[PDB]
Amino acid sequence: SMGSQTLPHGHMQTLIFLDLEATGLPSSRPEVTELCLLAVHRRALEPPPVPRPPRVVDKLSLCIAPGKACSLSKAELEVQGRQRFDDNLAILLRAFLQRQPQPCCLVAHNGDRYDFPLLQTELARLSTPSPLDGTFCVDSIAALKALEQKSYSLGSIYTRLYWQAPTDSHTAKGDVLTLLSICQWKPQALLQWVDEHARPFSTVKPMYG
Amino acid sequence: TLPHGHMQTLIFLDLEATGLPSSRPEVTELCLLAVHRRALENTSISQGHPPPVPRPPRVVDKLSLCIAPGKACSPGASEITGLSKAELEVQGRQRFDDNLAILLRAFLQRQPQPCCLVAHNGDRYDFPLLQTELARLSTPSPLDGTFCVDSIAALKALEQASSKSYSLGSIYTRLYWQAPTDSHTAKGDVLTLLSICQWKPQALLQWVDEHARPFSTVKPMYG
């Protein structure tokens, strides 16, 4: 069966649920102000109560000072001493990804239209090769539209699935956990959709140059 | 005068490990919450008896890593968490290695300095064990310029000023009249530790400033 149809890039061994905050919308040429990652091995994914997070999870959450003000705030990030999106941050990201079993796939809500192009732009500014260049990515809006076979905001999906209000809405810290919960609704089905739709992060076009 | 100046970042730290010290344990999970001094200082003043549990600051950096040990956990060491050696290996975790030190260093370098680790029983357990893990590596210590303090002594001082078990949960329940969430896990307890340290953040910061010592002076748990 499936003689001509195969996964594009094999089974993904790590899913990295990703959310970010930024100074504004694309035409403003925005900068990332917060980045939150939750890295889960596929085995941790191999009304309904809200699933508890897997016991083995790697997490990274960083606040990042932008060069220009938001439409978080630049001034408050600066009085908390936050540093820019820089080479040391790339070292950190590279070392964090290196601890994950490969292939690794980012999962971000609206990542295809926002988070992934923005991250591509931020990483392009740095001297060192992008640490995401061997990683894959998918957009969880597409995933949940496929699985629910309607708003596709993160909070609306969570309430539609779990019939209770989400926690800490519209913050990267809270929303990345909400994203994980939504992806644990049908975890085997989610993994299969991710395997089938993962694409190389290197093919993501920068938001701006 | 202050031994090492005013601390600009507090890094609340907890870890899971394979057993008690005589078992020559290894770290299986490391959880850090880095908070700038100003973020702690801006915490809403505790008022009322009990005061509300403080909300975590809006700006916190977080790192949480699971680590495969070389040896199995002791009986009952992974009960509450489920972080056995077999499970960490099933989920692809790597050992405590040079790349992990590089990761920790880059995380620390994003924090304003001077930076001070804060861990409950850190002087007798977390800090010596981390020193041992780092001593095996080929990198410099990533904690070479970082300070540390134990929050048991800190909260003993702060509760005596406002006035008895000093386990993390006992302190938190005494302060907030609520049971801590996800008790007796590094992931849960590091947040409980932050909440206790937000009770009286000005007095806590003053105590930390006066008692901070270099992590490099911490003696290894074992060699």
Side-chain angles (χ1 to χ4, degrees):
Chain A
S1 59
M2 298 288 93
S4 57
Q5 280 192 324
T6 60
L7 302 180
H9 303 289
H11 294 285
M12 297 294 110
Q13 297 300 307
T14 293
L15 282 57
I16 302 185
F17 303 93
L18 181 154
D19 201 351
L20 53 82
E21 297 175 353
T23 53
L25 294 171
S27 80
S28 78
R29 297 172 69 81
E31 293 182 76
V32 176
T33 53
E34 191 170 28
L35 178 67
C36 304
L37 309 181
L38 299 170
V40 181
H41 195 279
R42 74 176 288 121
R43 294 288 288 272
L45 303 155
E46 290 180 341
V50 183
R52 298 172 180 173
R55 185 51 185 94
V56 178
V57 180
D58 281 357
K59 321 177 182 175
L60 173 71
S61 191
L62 304 161
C63 287
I64 303 162
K68 64 179 188 218
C70 305
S71 54
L72 298 178
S73 63
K74 178 176 183 284
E76 185 58 34
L77 293 170
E78 296 177 338
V79 304
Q80 307 290 333
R82 294 311 100 190
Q83 288 172 3
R84 307 286 311 268
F85 203 111
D86 62 12
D87 290 327
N88 178 72
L89 172 58
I91 298 171
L92 196 177
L93 290 168
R94 184 178 298 114
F96 182 87
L97 297 163
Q98 179 169 307
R99 291 195 56 84
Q100 313 312 316
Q102 311 285 314
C104 179
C105 189
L106 313 175
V107 180
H109 212 65
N110 206 39
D112 284 351
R113 292 176 57 94
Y114 193 86
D115 308 38
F116 300 150
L118 181 51
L119 278 171
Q120 196 73 288
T121 288
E122 297 277 31
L123 289 168
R125 271 182 68 261
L126 306 184
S127 53
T128 41
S130 158
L132 288 174
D133 262 354
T135 302
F136 300 85
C137 60
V138 297
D139 192 320
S140 47
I141 294 171
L144 267 294
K145 288 175 176 169
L147 291 194
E148 286 194 286
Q149 303 156 1
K150 269 191 186 66
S151 164
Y152 280 87
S153 86
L154 199 64
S156 293
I157 299 170
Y158 179 94
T159 300
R160 179 161 70 243
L161 298 187
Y162 296 125
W163 262 109
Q164 53 190 120
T167 310
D168 295 314
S169 277
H170 312 291
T171 70
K173 292 194 172 85
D175 284 353
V176 74
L177 288 164
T178 300
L179 177 59
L180 170 58
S181 295
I182 285 160
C183 291
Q184 289 178 283
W185 176 54
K186 296 190 177 303
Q188 288 293 351
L190 189 275
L191 265 176
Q192 187 61 35
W193 183 95
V194 166
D195 287 344
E196 288 177 33
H197 294 85
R199 77 185 189 290
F201 191 82
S202 59
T203 65
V204 172
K205 175 176 78 60
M207 184 178 282
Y208 62 91
Chain B
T1 76
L2 286 185
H4 310 282
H6 296 292
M7 298 294 112
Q8 294 305 300
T9 305
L10 295 191
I11 303 198
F12 304 97
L13 180 153
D14 205 346
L15 49 78
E16 303 279 359
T18 54
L20 291 167
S22 82
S23 70
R24 300 171 64 86
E26 292 176 69
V27 175
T28 55
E29 199 182 25
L30 175 62
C31 308
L32 307 182
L33 295 176
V35 182
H36 194 272
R37 183 185 191 97
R38 295 283 290 280
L40 219 69
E41 294 182 325
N42 291 341
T43 301
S44 292
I45 301 308
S46 292
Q47 60 185 18
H49 296 112
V53 179
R55 294 180 182 170
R58 180 57 183 88
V59 175
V60 180
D61 283 357
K62 165 155 70 173
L63 174 69
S64 193
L65 301 166
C66 291
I67 302 156
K71 63 172 57 170
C73 304
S74 293
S78 59
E79 270 183 328
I80 302 177
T81 60
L83 297 183
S84 60
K85 172 176 176 293
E87 191 51 43
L88 294 157
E89 290 173 345
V90 158
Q91 311 271 319
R93 294 313 96 185
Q94 293 172 3
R95 309 278 313 267
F96 208 119
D97 63 2
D98 282 355
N99 179 73
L100 173 53
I102 289 165
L103 190 174
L104 290 167
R105 177 73 176 201
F107 179 84
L108 299 168
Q109 282 294 114
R110 292 197 52 88
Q111 312 309 320
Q113 317 280 315
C115 179
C116 189
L117 308 178
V118 178
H120 213 65
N121 210 34
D123 285 344
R124 288 172 61 82
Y125 191 86
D126 307 41
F127 303 150
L129 178 55
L130 279 172
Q131 194 73 284
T132 288
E133 293 279 22
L134 292 174
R136 285 175 306 110
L137 304 185
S138 87
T139 68
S141 169
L143 289 168
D144 256 353
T146 298
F147 304 91
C148 61
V149 299
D150 194 316
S151 47
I152 291 170
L155 266 294
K156 282 180 178 166
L158 265 57
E159 274 189 287
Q160 189 59 67
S162 71
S163 297
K164 230 186 184 180
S165 174
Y166 283 92
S167 80
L168 195 76
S170 298
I171 298 166
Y172 178 98
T173 300
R174 210 157 43 235
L175 299 194
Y176 301 125
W177 304 17
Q178 297 222 335
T181 304
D182 299 322
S183 193
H184 300 136
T185 69
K187 288 174 141 179
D189 287 348
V190 74
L191 289 163
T192 298
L193 178 56
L194 170 59
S195 296
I196 292 166
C197 286
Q198 282 182 280
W199 174 48
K200 289 200 185 306
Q202 295 314 136
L204 178 88
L205 281 167
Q206 186 66 35
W207 186 96
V208 165
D209 284 347
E210 295 175 31
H211 294 85
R213 74 186 192 291
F215 190 84
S216 64
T217 70
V218 173
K219 181 168 65 60
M221 179 176 284
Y222 61 90

Short mmCIF file of all heavy atoms in Angstrom, two decimals, chain B residues 79-108:
data_model
loop_
_atom_site.label_atom_id
_atom_site.label_comp_id
_atom_site.label_asym_id
_atom_site.label_seq_id
_atom_site.Cartn_x
_atom_site.Cartn_y
_atom_site.Cartn_z
N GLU B 79 9.75 8.24 42.11
CA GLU B 79 8.34 7.92 42.33
C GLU B 79 7.42 9.07 41.90
O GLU B 79 6.55 8.89 41.04
CB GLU B 79 8.11 7.60 43.80
CG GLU B 79 8.27 6.14 44.17
CD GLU B 79 7.94 5.90 45.63
OE1 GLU B 79 8.19 6.81 46.46
OE2 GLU B 79 7.43 4.81 45.96
N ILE B 80 7.59 10.25 42.52
CA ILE B 80 6.68 11.36 42.28
C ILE B 80 6.79 11.87 40.85
O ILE B 80 5.79 12.22 40.21
CB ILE B 80 6.93 12.49 43.31
CG1 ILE B 80 6.76 11.96 44.74
CG2 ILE B 80 6.00 13.68 43.06
CD1 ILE B 80 7.07 12.97 45.81
N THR B 81 8.01 11.91 40.32
CA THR B 81 8.25 12.47 39.00
C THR B 81 8.03 11.47 37.87
O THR B 81 7.38 11.79 36.88
CB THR B 81 9.67 13.04 38.93
OG1 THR B 81 10.61 11.99 39.18
CG2 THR B 81 9.83 14.12 39.98
N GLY B 82 8.54 10.24 38.01
CA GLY B 82 8.57 9.32 36.89
C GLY B 82 9.82 9.43 36.05
O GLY B 82 9.88 8.83 34.97
N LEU B 83 10.83 10.17 36.52
CA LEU B 83 12.10 10.34 35.81
C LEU B 83 13.10 9.25 36.22
O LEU B 83 14.15 9.52 36.81
CB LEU B 83 12.67 11.73 36.07
CG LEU B 83 11.88 12.96 35.60
CD1 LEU B 83 12.69 14.22 35.90
CD2 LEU B 83 11.59 12.85 34.12
N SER B 84 12.77 8.01 35.88
CA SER B 84 13.75 6.92 35.96
C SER B 84 14.80 7.06 34.85
O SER B 84 14.60 7.74 33.84
CB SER B 84 13.05 5.57 35.82
OG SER B 84 12.38 5.50 34.56
N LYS B 85 15.93 6.37 35.05
CA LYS B 85 16.96 6.30 34.01
C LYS B 85 16.40 5.68 32.72
O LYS B 85 16.68 6.16 31.62
CB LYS B 85 18.15 5.47 34.52
CG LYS B 85 19.20 5.15 33.46
CD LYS B 85 20.39 4.42 34.09
CE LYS B 85 21.40 4.01 33.04
NZ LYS B 85 20.83 2.97 32.13
N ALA B 86 15.63 4.60 32.85
CA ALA B 86 15.06 3.96 31.66
C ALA B 86 14.15 4.92 30.91
O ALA B 86 14.22 5.02 29.67
CB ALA B 86 14.31 2.69 32.06
N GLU B 87 13.31 5.67 31.63
CA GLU B 87 12.41 6.60 30.96
C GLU B 87 13.16 7.75 30.30
O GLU B 87 12.83 8.16 29.18
CB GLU B 87 11.37 7.15 31.94
CG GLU B 87 10.24 7.91 31.24
CD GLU B 87 9.60 7.10 30.09
OE1 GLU B 87 9.36 5.88 30.25
OE2 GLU B 87 9.35 7.69 29.01
N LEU B 88 14.18 8.29 30.97
CA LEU B 88 14.96 9.35 30.35
C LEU B 88 15.67 8.86 29.10
O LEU B 88 15.82 9.61 28.13
CB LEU B 88 15.97 9.90 31.35
CG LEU B 88 15.34 10.63 32.54
CD1 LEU B 88 16.30 10.62 33.71
CD2 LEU B 88 15.00 12.10 32.13
N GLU B 89 16.09 7.59 29.09
CA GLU B 89 16.74 7.06 27.89
C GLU B 89 15.72 6.78 26.79
O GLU B 89 16.01 7.02 25.61
CB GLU B 89 17.53 5.81 28.26
CG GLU B 89 18.76 6.13 29.11
CD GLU B 89 19.46 4.88 29.61
OE1 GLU B 89 18.85 3.78 29.56
OE2 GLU B 89 20.62 5.00 30.05
N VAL B 90 14.53 6.30 27.16
CA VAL B 90 13.45 6.05 26.21
C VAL B 90 13.10 7.33 25.46
O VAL B 90 12.78 7.30 24.27
CB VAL B 90 12.23 5.48 26.94
CG1 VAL B 90 10.96 5.70 26.13
CG2 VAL B 90 12.42 4.01 27.20
N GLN B 91 13.14 8.46 26.16
CA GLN B 91 12.83 9.77 25.60
C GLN B 91 14.05 10.49 25.04
O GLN B 91 13.99 11.71 24.82
CB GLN B 91 12.14 10.64 26.66
CG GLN B 91 10.98 9.95 27.38
CD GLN B 91 9.66 10.13 26.69
OE1 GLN B 91 9.36 11.22 26.20
NE2 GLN B 91 8.87 9.07 26.63
N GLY B 92 15.17 9.79 24.84
CA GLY B 92 16.31 10.33 24.12
C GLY B 92 17.16 11.37 24.85
O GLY B 92 17.87 12.13 24.19
N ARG B 93 17.10 11.44 26.17
CA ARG B 93 17.87 12.47 26.86
C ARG B 93 19.36 12.17 26.81
O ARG B 93 19.79 11.02 26.88
CB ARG B 93 17.45 12.60 28.32
CG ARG B 93 16.03 13.10 28.52
CD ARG B 93 15.71 14.34 27.65
NE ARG B 93 15.04 13.98 26.41
CZ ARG B 93 14.73 14.85 25.45
NH1 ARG B 93 15.04 16.15 25.58
NH2 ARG B 93 14.11 14.43 24.35
N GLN B 94 20.16 13.22 26.72
CA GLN B 94 21.60 13.07 26.72
C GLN B 94 22.18 13.21 28.14
O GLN B 94 21.55 13.75 29.05
CB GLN B 94 22.23 14.10 25.77
CG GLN B 94 21.91 13.85 24.34
CD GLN B 94 22.37 14.97 23.43
OE1 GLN B 94 23.01 15.93 23.87
NE2 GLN B 94 22.04 14.85 22.16
N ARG B 95 23.41 12.75 28.30
CA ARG B 95 24.09 12.86 29.58
C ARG B 95 24.45 14.31 29.88
O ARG B 95 24.30 15.21 29.04
CB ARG B 95 25.37 12.03 29.60
CG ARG B 95 25.17 10.58 29.16
CD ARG B 95 24.66 9.74 30.31
NE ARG B 95 25.42 10.00 31.53
CZ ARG B 95 26.47 9.29 31.93
NH1 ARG B 95 26.90 8.26 31.21
NH2 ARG B 95 27.09 9.62 33.06
N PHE B 96 24.89 14.53 31.12
CA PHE B 96 25.50 15.79 31.55
C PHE B 96 26.85 15.94 30.86
O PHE B 96 27.77 15.17 31.15
CB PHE B 96 25.66 15.78 33.07
CG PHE B 96 25.62 17.15 33.70
CD1 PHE B 96 24.64 17.49 34.62
CD2 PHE B 96 26.55 18.13 33.32
CE1 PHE B 96 24.61 18.77 35.20
CE2 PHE B 96 26.52 19.42 33.90
CZ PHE B 96 25.55 19.73 34.83
N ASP B 97 26.99 16.87 29.90
CA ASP B 97 28.20 16.87 29.09
C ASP B 97 28.66 18.30 28.78
O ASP B 97 28.11 19.28 29.28
CB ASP B 97 28.00 16.03 27.80
CG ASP B 97 26.93 16.60 26.86
OD1 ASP B 97 26.32 17.66 27.14
OD2 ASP B 97 26.66 15.95 25.83
N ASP B 98 29.71 18.41 27.95
CA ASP B 98 30.26 19.73 27.62
C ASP B 98 29.23 20.62 26.96
O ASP B 98 29.16 21.83 27.26
CB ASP B 98 31.47 19.58 26.71
CG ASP B 98 32.74 19.17 27.45
OD1 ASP B 98 32.73 19.06 28.69
OD2 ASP B 98 33.76 18.94 26.78
N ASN B 99 28.42 20.07 26.05
CA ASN B 99 27.40 20.89 25.40
C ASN B 99 26.42 21.44 26.42
O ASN B 99 25.92 22.56 26.26
CB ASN B 99 26.68 20.08 24.32
CG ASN B 99 25.60 20.87 23.66
OD1 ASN B 99 25.88 21.77 22.87
ND2 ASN B 99 24.34 20.56 23.98
N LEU B 100 26.11 20.67 27.47
CA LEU B 100 25.20 21.18 28.48
C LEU B 100 25.84 22.34 29.25
O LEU B 100 25.15 23.30 29.61
CB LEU B 100 24.79 20.05 29.44
CG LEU B 100 23.95 20.41 30.68
CD1 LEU B 100 22.76 21.17 30.27
CD2 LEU B 100 23.47 19.16 31.44
N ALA B 101 27.14 22.26 29.54
CA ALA B 101 27.81 23.40 30.18
C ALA B 101 27.77 24.63 29.27
O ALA B 101 27.57 25.76 29.75
CB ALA B 101 29.25 23.06 30.53
N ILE B 102 27.99 24.43 27.96
CA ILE B 102 27.92 25.54 27.02
C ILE B 102 26.52 26.14 27.01
O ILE B 102 26.35 27.37 26.96
CB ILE B 102 28.39 25.07 25.63
CG1 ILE B 102 29.91 24.83 25.66
CG2 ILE B 102 28.01 26.07 24.55
CD1 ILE B 102 30.43 24.02 24.47
N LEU B 103 25.50 25.28 27.06
CA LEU B 103 24.12 25.74 27.10
C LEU B 103 23.88 26.57 28.35
O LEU B 103 23.30 27.66 28.27
CB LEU B 103 23.18 24.53 27.05
CG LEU B 103 21.67 24.69 26.85
CD1 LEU B 103 21.01 23.28 26.70
CD2 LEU B 103 21.00 25.45 27.92
N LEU B 104 24.30 26.04 29.52
CA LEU B 104 24.10 26.76 30.77
C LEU B 104 24.83 28.09 30.77
O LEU B 104 24.31 29.09 31.26
CB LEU B 104 24.59 25.93 31.96
CG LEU B 104 23.74 24.70 32.28
CD1 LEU B 104 24.51 23.80 33.24
CD2 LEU B 104 22.40 25.11 32.90
N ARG B 105 26.08 28.09 30.29
CA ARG B 105 26.84 29.34 30.23
C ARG B 105 26.12 30.39 29.38
O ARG B 105 26.03 31.56 29.76
CB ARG B 105 28.22 29.08 29.66
CG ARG B 105 29.06 30.35 29.50
CD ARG B 105 29.53 30.86 30.84
NE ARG B 105 30.42 32.02 30.68
CZ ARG B 105 31.29 32.43 31.61
NH1 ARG B 105 31.40 31.78 32.75
NH2 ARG B 105 32.05 33.49 31.38
N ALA B 106 25.59 29.98 28.22
CA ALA B 106 24.96 30.97 27.35
C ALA B 106 23.68 31.48 27.99
O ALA B 106 23.33 32.65 27.82
CB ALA B 106 24.69 30.39 25.94
N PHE B 107 22.97 30.62 28.72
CA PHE B 107 21.79 31.07 29.44
C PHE B 107 22.17 32.07 30.52
O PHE B 107 21.53 33.13 30.65
CB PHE B 107 21.06 29.85 30.03
CG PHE B 107 19.83 30.21 30.81
CD1 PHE B 107 18.61 30.40 30.17
CD2 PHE B 107 19.89 30.34 32.20
CE1 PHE B 107 17.47 30.71 30.89
CE2 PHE B 107 18.76 30.64 32.92
CZ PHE B 107 17.54 30.83 32.27
N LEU B 108 23.21 31.75 31.31
CA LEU B 108 23.67 32.66 32.37
C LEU B 108 24.11 33.99 31.81
O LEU B 108 23.90 35.04 32.44
CB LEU B 108 24.83 32.03 33.15
CG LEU B 108 24.42 30.74 33.83
CD1 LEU B 108 25.67 29.99 34.36
CD2 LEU B 108 23.46 31.11 34.93
#
